Design a protein around this ligand. Structure first.
Ligand SMILES: Nc1nc2c(ncn2[C@@H]2O[C@H](CO)[C@@H](O)[C@H]2OP(=O)(O)O)c(=O)[nH]1
Ligand SMILES: [Ca+2]
Length: 104
């Protein structure tokens, strides 16, 4: 069983924790990776019911189990805050264009 399902993609809690820690370390040192500048501000245009406070930052979570360091992001993103608390895991899979849906 998947703890988070993003279209076809299966994610456990450890997958989410490894991706989040990588994302936060880079946020605090003011560094970014890749061509789209990861991590950046997750603005929340969709209006999701995140039980943690604002501002929100998005970072890629890869299907292969590897951490992001440059190149292709994929469809899936883990959202954390300024406190290093998980907001949720979102995806562009099954959403129109550059929009998002929450992972089930
Ligand atoms: N859909 C959407 N896109 C956002 C939001 N905050 C930042 N973006 C980023 O802006 C683009 C929308 O033009 C998206 O492809 C997405 O980048 P990522 O590709 O980095 O996930 C948001 O809350 N909603
Ligand atoms: Ca895994």
């Amino acid at each position: 069983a998947c703890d988070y399902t993003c279209g076809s993609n299966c994610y456990s809690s450890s997958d989410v924790s490894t991706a989040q820690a990588a994302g936060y370390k880079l946020h605090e040192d003011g560094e970014t990776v890749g061509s789209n500048s990861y991590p950046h501000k997750a603005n929340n245009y969709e209006g999701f019911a995140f039980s943690v406070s604002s501002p929100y930052y998005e970072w890629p979570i890869l299907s292969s189990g590897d951490v992001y360091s440059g190149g292709s992001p994929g469809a899936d993103r883990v959202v954390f805050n300024e406190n290093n608390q998980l907001a949720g895991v979102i995806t562009h899979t099954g959403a129109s264009g550059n929009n998002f849906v929450e992972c089930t």
